[PDB]
């Protein structure tokens, strides 16, 4: 094992991290990268045509991170910008009026849940197809969003260095957003309130501590 890697400068990192994958600093004290995580019971495994273990872990990291990135804004938005203009002529019985994120899950029509689940299933069926058909040449991410060659309504083009910089930004935001989403969820659970109704009271003053006011007459 290599010794003294950036991050954990008094520790060690496995030899499998190397360079390659963007975002690599050497943070891997336990392992998880020297084990066949993409070969044991994988039903879509293809001998001599699949990806490596660390790339599989990167795929998992990207998935968890993108979900968390969406989830943070999902937690914050309805409480601060107001609810969706929906619920009109829907007979929802103020379903969308609720702003506590842990309460809205018990008041939405089942059609919304099933639509979300179906959309996710479709997206990742496409992802599975791409993974199988791309062989042992995996560009990571895939799913064909806005890059030349795939779907690209805005026709985004980037120089290779710009593409690498975008990849680095994406991975950093993914990690930070995972931490933030975890924190927001458990804060809201323990406090029993959304983030805005928990932070706004602690902005100016408590009611029992503020002074009565100014009553001194003027002109005397």
């Amino acid at each position: 094992w290599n010794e003294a890697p950036r991050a954990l400068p008094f520790g060690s990192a496995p030899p499998t991290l190397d360079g390659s994958l963007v975002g690599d600093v050497g943070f891997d004290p336990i392992g998880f990268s020297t084990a066949p995580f993409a070969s044991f019971n994988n039903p879509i495994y293809q001998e001599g045509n699949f990806m490596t273990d660390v790339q599989w872990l990167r795929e998992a990291e990207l998935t968890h991170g993108r979900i968390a990135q969406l989830a943070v804004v999902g937690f914050i938005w309805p409480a601060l910008f107001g609810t969706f203009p929906g619920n009109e002529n829907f007979g929802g019985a103020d379903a969308y009026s609720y702003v506590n994120p842990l309460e809205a899950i018990n008041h939405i029509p089942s059609l919304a849940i099933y639509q979300i689940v179906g959309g996710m299933a479709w997206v990742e069926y496409q992802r599975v197809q791409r993974i199988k058909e791309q062989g042992k040449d995996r560009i990571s991410g895939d799913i064909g969003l806005a890059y030349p060659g795939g779907w690209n309504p805005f026709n985004i083009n980037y120089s290779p260095e710009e593409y690498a910089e975008k990849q680095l930004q994406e991975i950093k935001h993914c990690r930070l957003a995972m931490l933030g989403a975890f924190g927001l969820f458990f804060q809201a659970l323990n406090s029993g309130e959304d983030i805005v109704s928990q932070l706004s009271p602690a902005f100016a003053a408590p009611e029992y501590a503020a002074k009565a006011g100014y009553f001194l007459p003027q002109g005397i």
């Binding site: 094992w1 392992g31 020297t34 084990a35 066949p36 995580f37 044991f40 019971n41």
Partner: protein, 163 residues
């Protein structure tokens, strides 16, 4: 004689001479017991604290006997029906006798020195957890047999921020 698990706090700690001569197979069997007992103790200490705040909300018997209701500690073995214990022990035996629900990707391939250090650490943490379990059940049974005895209140005397 001299194997993994010897640390400077003591030097051999074999007062009763339970090893003496024996044989290699007997010592290997002893070590395998020391590990299994230690891992079980670690898991038990960890799982004696978790139900104090969380509790999966499923029904052991459909209709009654929700996990939200059964008491925590040594009073659970009386509440849970015998069939549940039988099924759990059967599942553990399925895990142990066969290789089911076990994956060979957790063994890892660490270098020799890292492996030795981690094995010693595993043994030490297990050995601490065994005595932890001893105090835990001592206090629980003493308080349950006659309330008020051992005037400290609540399960888990340490970590008072739970209550």
């Amino acid at each position: 004689e001299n194997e993994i698990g010897v640390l400077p706090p003591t030097g051999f700690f074999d007062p009763a001479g339970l090893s003496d001569g024996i044989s290699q197979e007997k010592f290997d069997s002893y070590r395998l017991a020391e590990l299994k007992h230690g891992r079980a103790a670690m898991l038990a200490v960890l799982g004696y604290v978790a139900p104090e705040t969380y509790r999966f909300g499923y029904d052991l018997i459909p209709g009654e006997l929700s996990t939200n209701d059964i008491p925590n500690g040594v009073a659970a073995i009386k509440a849970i029906p015998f069939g549940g214990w039988a099924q759990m022990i059967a599942f553990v035996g399925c895990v142990e006798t066969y290789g089911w629900f076990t994956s060979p990707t957790g063994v890892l391939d660490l270098p020799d020195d890292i492996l030795a250090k981690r094995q010693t650490a595993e043994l030490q943490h297990g050995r601490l957890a065994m005595l932890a379990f001893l105090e835990l059940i001592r206090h629980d049974s003493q308080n349950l047999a006659q309330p008020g005895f051992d005037g400290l209140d609540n399960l888990i005397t340490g970590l008072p921020f739970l209550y």
